[PDB]
Design a protein around this ligand. Structure first.
Ligand SMILES: *[C@@H]1O[C@H](CO[C@@H]2O[C@@H](C)[C@@H](O)[C@@H](O)[C@@H]2O)[C@@H](O[C@@H]2O[C@H](CO)[C@@H](O)[C@H](O)[C@H]2NC(C)=O)[C@H](O)[C@H]1NC(C)=O
Ligand SMILES: *[C@@H]1O[C@H](CO[C@@H]2O[C@@H](C)[C@@H](O)[C@@H](O)[C@@H]2O)[C@@H](O[C@@H]2O[C@H](CO)[C@@H](O)[C@H](O)[C@H]2NC(C)=O)[C@H](O)[C@H]1NC(C)=O
Ligand SMILES: *[C@@H]1O[C@H](CO[C@@H]2O[C@@H](C)[C@@H](O)[C@@H](O)[C@@H]2O)[C@@H](O[C@@H]2O[C@H](CO)[C@@H](O)[C@H](O)[C@H]2NC(C)=O)[C@H](O)[C@H]1NC(C)=O
Ligand SMILES: *[C@@H]1O[C@H](CO[C@@H]2O[C@@H](C)[C@@H](O)[C@@H](O)[C@@H]2O)[C@@H](O[C@@H]2O[C@H](CO)[C@@H](O)[C@H](O)[C@H]2NC(C)=O)[C@H](O)[C@H]1NC(C)=O
Ligand SMILES: *[C@@H]1O[C@H](CO[C@@H]2O[C@@H](C)[C@@H](O)[C@@H](O)[C@@H]2O)[C@@H](O)[C@H](O)[C@H]1NC(C)=O
Ligand SMILES: *[C@@H]1O[C@H](CO[C@@H]2O[C@@H](C)[C@@H](O)[C@@H](O)[C@@H]2O)[C@@H](O)[C@H](O)[C@H]1NC(C)=O
Ligand SMILES: *[C@@H]1O[C@H](CO[C@@H]2O[C@@H](C)[C@@H](O)[C@@H](O)[C@@H]2O)[C@@H](O)[C@H](O)[C@H]1NC(C)=O
Ligand SMILES: *[C@@H]1O[C@H](CO[C@@H]2O[C@@H](C)[C@@H](O)[C@@H](O)[C@@H]2O)[C@@H](O)[C@H](O)[C@H]1NC(C)=O
Ligand SMILES: CCC(CC)O[C@@H]1C=C(C(=O)O)C[C@H](N)[C@H]1NC(C)=O
Ligand SMILES: CCC(CC)O[C@@H]1C=C(C(=O)O)C[C@H](N)[C@H]1NC(C)=O
Ligand SMILES: CCC(CC)O[C@@H]1C=C(C(=O)O)C[C@H](N)[C@H]1NC(C)=O
Ligand SMILES: CCC(CC)O[C@@H]1C=C(C(=O)O)C[C@H](N)[C@H]1NC(C)=O
Ligand SMILES: [Ca+2]
Ligand SMILES: [Ca+2]
Ligand SMILES: [Ca+2]
Ligand SMILES: [Ca+2]
Ligand SMILES: [Ca+2]
Lengths: 388, 388, 388, 388
């Protein structure tokens, strides 16, 4: 017997430390590794797992040619041991999906899997291995979701979903699901948030989601949610923005609306509120998906004239390719430990990655209340060594 | 401790949704995947599994040349994680078999495995990993069985078996087996059914089997069975037939006998009775094994002048190869959820599939009481990319 | 909690039926499969397992060249799912060994593993994964053991061991081991048995071992053992001999001594006493390791003028290569089901197998109290297809 | 429920016997095996596991070229079934690390993982899969640890750590960690020990560590530790030294300080105190990492004029490459069984190993209170067969 996960506070922390790293591309040189993208991490009571959207092809084979394409019927949400490369011998196929979210509620796994035509997609709700519910596209425009772990409190899981234009006004909803059955949804208030994609969420008593505005905001939109309703929304106040592309530091302090500067497109990212402060992951480049750093902004969560980057951890050099990133939590007695993964994208359309495929490796970090050292943990592949 | 599966009613549903998909051929381009055919799905308390008849060779190797052949000593019923490709690293060999059925009774797995000479085959009964009984060919003419999951109620499993000509009058029996020991069998009444092959079965209080008449019927023969006897038989009334080959819609309403039109040969298929209505899977083509759709026929289960195709879900385009299909169930609290798999056959004898081997990938769908969207989930392989 | 296996009687049976088959050579065409020989089967409470002596090389690689050699430091007893091919992704290395025996006592696995110099080998006793005892070579001449499963009764396991010349008078012992600790041994009485190798054992109240006389006997030596001592010995009375090489049927009825005809060398084989009758496995050829059949000899266990082959099941054609064979049991409520495996040797020194390596596949059969059909289940490899 | 491991005495023993052997290089000829080094073994309640520092590349691929390099971001502590080769299908990635230690405390696994820049590395403490603590480099000079299993008593684990010059005075600490949280550390007294690296530890009531002095000592430094403090230190008295390089036998009896002869560099090794005697592993060569033997020195643990090598077991010939070695224990009722692994290094910089990569296979031995035989268990690879 296992109780449902509880609304625990976020553990104290002051730095992030290297956790698991898969070196999936390096290890895929001999065509053993499954082509993937949009990876993430989520944990149950016994293990943390790597998840990702597979492309139904092995890296370096002819079927991997052209996998830059986002949505096909041959993509499945797959799961593999955290820090290992995904191979036919160790993976599990979760569901058919070109967009997904996963979260464990203390007892069973829930998955949200979008697939089908762009104008008529549906989301399948999987609970304990069984398809228990669905969501039918209501704007008929690429129904899609987080690409990282959802969150569950006292048996009720919460997940953010979008249907509509990627570079214009769209529809954003939160769904509450309990044991695989949709209980309700809410349209996200547009009083502050103007665009919302690929939410990275975690628990700190309530569920906090820090997302991607793909339209007008170089700052990141955010939500605070409990097991019943949306409690609060806004954009991260930090005048040091964390989307890509974005303005140079310092930019505008925009707590209540998109910045309206370098607004589109964007990249999936994450953050952690810490008191009135905020930690923000981001690419080192302001324009491209290269490098990765995480900054702590003093008073960056609130409307203040005192914003300052008190810390900057450089985890992937700007000489190396990054990509998506997202939050996940690990239970730690009476608090949740904040962690994150970084997607290291190799292949198209990256400059000088002369291969026909598109894939990624994974690197992860966790927060501790200790002082960290420093280093660099990039993909590490010599693309010249790879089957094209 | 686990109780035996109960005679639960079929859950309500109004559409079918994409579940698991393995992309096994695409993934087999580098010779990692086991050659298979006659795949299916069956679930225990913890997982759903893919099953299939392997050919004792890896796809794309010289030993895969000529695997169009149906029965050899080198075929085994194998089991692999649902939605993954079958590789040496993840498969389990269940038994030697060129024809099989599998079903979980709540406590243990049962398997029925036919192998040996065509004129002197035997069926091995496996229960909890142990060979517990057997059936000796009594017509000495390719003793064979469902090629999809059997059903068990209150500890007694039911399975349909055929011995005799494939295109003429044969013998059809149902066997009741409890904990691996044959309790009894019955010869299927020929008052209505004239030919019976490859039954696709499920539970809706009683066991319903919808099968393949390979002789005179373009309509599908059916049985209703409990844990003791055959209760009812007939052919699906629907004037919209569901075998391949078959007449164009609409055809004859034949509740009580084979249609006698486009009667031979046929393809393994399935259906679900829903009140007086019936859902029927079928290839899109009336002549070939291409495409896949499932139709709901209003009042299609009964003798009525009101038959109408109220729904048509097109799940595989007619531009893509299909193959066998079959039912399986997943327990859902106090009802059984109806699902199905579709075999996507690639290689010989398919036109323009220029390879020497014969194999398949798998795609699955489950029923929900929600409105579905639409899409297309074919095999997806560029046969030109494959080792021949 | 699990009780120790009990001294159950052998189940009734009247024929043998196809069980698991791995097709390991066929499946090894692309160099995925581990080179092996001396395979066998043994079962615990949850699964039956394939065991074998690996050669520390993959089939078809340069390191597989010359694996005809019997004893090297690079051989390990490995274990893999029954009926699957042994690959790096699914095998477990049990111990370093060029000779082995394995048996489950109801609670834990025991293994006996011989390795080291021919003139100073030692046997390691493994119990529950821990090395718990050892046997030091006392004749300093290739200390060796069964190459098939041992047997355990009420917590005490029994295993036959040989140290000495392979074609002359040697030393033969039985060791009793309880929870991995050697309790005692006995020198096998030479009042009847003159040479003993590679015992195939099973339980029928007491432990019965039917072995290989590599010196003067074309008939097979046998022992009957309980958890304390050797109770009885002799040679199988059947005037229809079951070693290879051997005389044509019928030969001498030699219950009490080796036949002294076609006495050397020999092959590992098995048998099952059934009342006063005996079932005997053997190659179809009287001279070579080709084909495989099992015969039932009426009154073949006793001194009688009425010996007759009442049954002959031909399971591998004489056109196909066989090899070793051995008994194993599967618990069946209140009796033990008799089963056996057959080693299908491919490569050197087999005539027309033009490869540099030596390996094998596996096929198995179990006994039931039903009438069997017929068929042929050989290795199935086209050696011309294989990497040399 | 499982209690924490207890402070059990070391079991009696008088020899060492072949246990598991992986033949990883031989088996890696077809590019399936992960490049590794610094391997070791550690056991939980159910299994013994192989651990190693992977290089994030497959053996024989272009990414394996130049893996002689000690520290990169692409190295992870990985775990695989004991005696199997590490492949993508069977490995688990434990943590990012170019230096590590692992030990099971009776309930959960603990890992210590060093990674990052040489001048700013950190050690991550993993407990039950969760990162629970860290150590920040305090000398900023390659923070590093044992490369073999740590030890845990009554819930408190002990691990030796070094930060500083490799060939000069450095800092050496022991950390006590309970359930993943650092309780305390102590600076190792330099009253006797002058240099300490790569400690090989085991339990004999208290924790004994026998280590590597890389500076002035051809004799090995040692510590005795309980769950609270360092109790004792020194160098192994044995005038028969056990580091590499070292003087010819006999050398100086140096119980209290480094020998000051052939002092640098060194190799990771191990030993077992047995009463006043000591068993010592070592390479057969006094200068190179070739061959492996273990000697028992009478009164070699104490200050005595009676030192004599009473036993010498030659386990790897001097014609074969060895490498690191280390102790591990296996619980045996009411005592701990002493065992050890030997790293068999192949590739650079070994003379005549003409490949660009650097990797290793593994062989292991355990102690029993019986007389052993003899043999030779080297890597066994023909380097000429390998992909370069
Ligand atoms: C990756 O694929 C492209 C495109 O492949 C072509 O179209 C595909 C859909 C498929 O049908 C293939 O068979 C086709 O070749 C390759 O680009 C082609 O390369 C050929 C040969 O050099 C050239 O003649 C064509 O003009 C190219 N076609 C296009 C549309 O650009 C490319 O070579 C592949 N890359 C790798 C590394 O294999
Ligand atoms: C698939 O196999 C066929 C047939 O293989 C032949 O017969 C088999 C039983 C086996 O013994 C093989 O060694 C034989 O080659 C192949 O067709 C043959 O191809 C050869 C060479 O082109 C030709 O000379 C023969 O006439 C063909 N034989 C027949 C009976 O058609 C075919 O090439 C194989 N396909 C692939 C993709 O390898
Ligand atoms: C299988 O191996 C034999 C022998 O290999 C030789 O000796 C081995 C120990 C090893 O050191 C190899 O490098 C040696 O080649 C091979 O037989 C040799 O073949 C070569 C080349 O044709 C020939 O010149 C030698 O005379 C042969 N040596 C002997 C002793 O017969 C054989 O080719 C290998 N078989 C395969 C399929 O690779
Ligand atoms: C192992 O690698 C070396 C070095 O590789 C070179 O530098 C690497 C960092 C990488 O960038 C490679 O692309 C480079 O080739 C190889 O040595 C080189 O070999 C080439 C071709 O013979 C020669 O022209 C260069 O001078 C060499 N470079 C150096 C620095 O020595 C070597 O061939 C590789 N070994 C194997 C077995 O592949
Ligand atoms: C929602 O969860 C509640 C949990 O208890 C408390 O109330 C909620 C609103 C949060 O503030 C949480 O942190 C508190 O601990 C339950 O009381 C309530 O029954 C749940 N409601 C539903 C719809 O399940
Ligand atoms: C068969 O199973 C019965 C189950 O109970 C009920 O009766 C059967 C005939 C069905 O109608 C089922 O739906 C009902 O729930 C048992 O009563 C009976 O003992 C069983 N008989 C055998 C041969 O096992
Ligand atoms: C040996 O096992 C005995 C088992 O009980 C019976 O006696 C033996 C000799 C056999 O005939 C068996 O079939 C019987 O069931 C135990 O009585 C005895 O204690 C055991 N002795 C040892 C040495 O463990
Ligand atoms: C340390 O462990 C102790 C174990 O009991 C005994 O005392 C120690 C010092 C050793 O001598 C051991 O062999 C003995 O069995 C506990 O008493 C003590 O509470 C523990 N202290 C800490 C810090 O956990
Ligand atoms: C369609 C909108 C959406 C969010 C901006 O596009 C995405 C951005 C992507 C990106 O910027 O890398 C790739 C994604 N896999 C994707 N999601 C889907 C379903 O295609
Ligand atoms: C022998 C009759 C039988 C049913 C019509 O033939 C089948 C039809 C087949 C088909 O139409 O694809 C292939 C099958 N694997 C098969 N079953 C066996 C045992 O060979
Ligand atoms: C050394 C005597 C022994 C029994 C006759 O030889 C064997 C017969 C063999 C055989 O006839 O195939 C091969 C064996 N693997 C073997 N056992 C060992 C340890 O080498
Ligand atoms: C930096 C000091 C240290 C101990 C002498 O060097 C080592 C010796 C090595 C050796 O002699 O083989 C290789 C090691 N993997 C290593 N440890 C690290 C972290 O690089
Ligand atoms: Ca943006
Ligand atoms: Ca038909
Ligand atoms: Ca003989
Ligand atoms: Ca491969
Ligand atoms: Ca030294």
């Amino acid at each position: 017997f296992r109780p449902f996960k509880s609304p625990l506070p976020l553990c104290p922390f002051r730095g992030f430390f290297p956790f698991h790293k898969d070196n999936a591309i390096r290890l895929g040189e001999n065509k053993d590794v499954i082509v993937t993208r949009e990876p993430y991490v989520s944990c149950d009571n016994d293990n943390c797992w790597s998840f990702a959207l597979a492309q139904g092809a092995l890296l370096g084979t002819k079927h991997s040619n052209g996998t830059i394409k986002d949505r096909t019927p041959y993509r499945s949400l797959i799961r593999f041991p955290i820090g290992t490369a995904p191979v036919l011998g160790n993976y599990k196929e979760i569901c058919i999906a070109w967009s997904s979210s996963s979260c464990f509620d203390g007892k069973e796994w829930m998955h949200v899997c979008m697939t089908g035509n762009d104008n008529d997609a549906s989301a399948q709700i999987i609970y304990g291995g069984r398809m228990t519910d669905s969501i039918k596209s209501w704007r008929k425009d690429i129904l899609r979701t987080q690409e990282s772990e959802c969150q569950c409190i006292d048996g009720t899981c919460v997940v953010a979903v979008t249907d509509g234009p990627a570079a214009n006004s769209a529809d954003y909803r939160v769904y509450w699901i309990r044991e695989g059955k949709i209980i309700k949804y809410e349209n996200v208030p547009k009083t502050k948030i103007q665009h919302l994609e690929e939410c990275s969420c975690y628990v700190d008593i309530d569920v906090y989601c820090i997302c991607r505005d793909n339209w007008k905001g170089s700052n990141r939109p955010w939500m605070r949610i409990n097991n019943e309703t949306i409690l609060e929304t806004g954009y991260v106040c930090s005048k040091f923005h964390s989307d890509t592309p974005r303005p140079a530091d310092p930019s505008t302090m925009s707590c209540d609306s998109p910045s309206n500067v370098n607004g589109g497109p964007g990249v999936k990212g994450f953050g952690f509120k810490a008191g009135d402060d905020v930690w923000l992951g981001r690419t080192v480049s302001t324009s491209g998906r290269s490098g990765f750093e995480i900054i702590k902004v003093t008073e960056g969560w609130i409307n203040s004239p005192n914003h300052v980057k008190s810390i900057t951890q450089t985890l992937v050099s700007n000489n190396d390719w990054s990509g998506y990133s997202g939050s996940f939590i690990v239970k730690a007695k009476d608090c949740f430990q904040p962690c994150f993964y970084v997607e290291l994208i190799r292949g198209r359309p990256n400059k000088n990655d002369d291969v026909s495929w598109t894939s990624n490796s994974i690197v992860t970090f966790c927060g501790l209340d200790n002082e960290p050292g420093s280093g660099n943990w990039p993909d590490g592949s010599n693309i010249g060594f790879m089957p094209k």
